[PDB]
Design a protein around this ligand. Structure first.
Ligand code: 0YZ
Ligand code: 0YZ
Ligand code: 0YZ
Lengths: 206, 210
């Protein structure tokens, strides 16, 4: 069964323009598609769902109460150290609120890049070496792994990209070494529970 | 015109191809070698700068010798990527020689993965950087993406523009990781021994259109 699904949610802009509407309308329909995918994963026993929008967190932090009632653990991945400190504190508070939740873990990428993610772990090892706490030839895959995002969760089983492009676009790199990759032309606001189940079958047929 | 400078291929389907024919596996590998020659000639004749091949055998790579002379005669530059350091001195020495012989060539650059993994590739780059930090040459905070980029396999070649995987599975299987952050990914159900010039044209024209 699929334990950790990651989604590159692309197509909101193209959807709005096909509908003859401004870019803001596609965002609002995108956010409804987020709610539906989060609900569907939580009801189908997926352990972790990681969402990359291909700031906008301001929106979310009015849904945290609902997540928390639903037993969802919320985490933001990505470089938030330059966000304003009021947002950084609201991120911190939301993560602390839900940290003890034992249902679905929802990871929201916010200023995230796969290369950045690896580089941030390398910087950490680099400090250890400079402190004299670590030998260069003791650095292996297992050790680097312990310093990249999500290393405490089930490995990513399946990556879905909506919107028609066939690229990872510097979303997760280290983590997707063994993941099933599923590409669909459906635009993110139209991506629904049947589309999600479609992807879960491609994995079931691996 | 296709716009593609560096194509990487996960060559899968040799076992399935032989099974479909009622053959033992040594036959799929032989047909797979023929398809390698064909892809290499196709790339060299269609302006691609670099072609990087991942066989998804140890006796297969050893037999290369006849092959390296044919490469050289077609002005291909050969390089092996992967961890060759626990290979026998002897193999290691024929690798160096084969590289040295062809390193002046000006046509296609052909990279062959041998004991390669994406994760390993990143790890070896990180170790090069950690050595420099330990000898006091490098500060932890000067380490950025461009710098780690300069230490992974193939950094001196054009970025990988297109990854092709034959054989039907939709995964990277710990082939390139760092290097494919922006690459076009093209999956075909065609098995590797059947993948021919028109399938390769098809993948290039798909990259051009996308
Ligand atoms: C801009 C992004 C906004 C969306 C952020 C995700 C918030 C999702 C809010 C609902 O969260 C869950 C989690 C687990 C289960 C359910 C769930 O059962 C929802 C329902 O039954 C319903 O909405 O009718 C909802
Ligand atoms: C361990 C390294 C083994 C990799 C083996 C690949 C062998 C490829 C040999 C064929 O090479 C080329 C290269 C470029 C062009 C051509 C090519 O067009 C050759 C011809 O037209 C011909 O020989 O008549 C052949
Ligand atoms: C026409 C000439 C045929 C070209 C032959 C090219 C295939 C060469 C492949 C060499 O493959 C090796 C050699 C030694 C070890 C490995 C190997 O272990 C690869 C792995 O473990 C892995 O990818 O996880 C692969």
């Amino acid at each position: 069964g699929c334990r950790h699904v990651a989604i590159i949610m692309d197509g909101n802009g193209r959807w709005a323009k096909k509908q003859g509407k401004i870019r803001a309308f596609g965002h609002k329909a995108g956010a409804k598609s987020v709610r539906r995918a989060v609900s569907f994963a939580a009801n189908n026993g997926i352990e972790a769902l990681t969402l990359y929008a291909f700031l906008f967190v301001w929106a979310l932090d009015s849904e945290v109460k609902s997540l928390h009632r639903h037993n969802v653990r919320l985490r933001i991945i990505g470089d938030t150290s330059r966000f304003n400190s009021r947002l950084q504190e609201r991120i911190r508070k939301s993560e602390a609120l839900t940290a003890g939740n034992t249902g679905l873990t929802l990871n929201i990428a916010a200023n995230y890049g796969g290369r950045w993610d690896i580089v941030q772990g390398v910087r950490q090892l680099a400090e250890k070496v400079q402190q004299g706490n670590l030998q260069p030839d003791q650095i292996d895959e297992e050790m680097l792994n312990q310093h990249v995002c999500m290393h405490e969760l089930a490995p990513v089983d399946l990556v879905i990209r909506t919107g028609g492009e066939h690229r990872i676009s510097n979303f997760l790199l280290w983590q997707i070494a063994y993941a099933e990759l599923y590409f669909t032309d459906v635009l993110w606001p139209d991506f629904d529970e049947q589309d999600f189940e479609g992807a879960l079958n491609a994995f079931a047929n691996r």
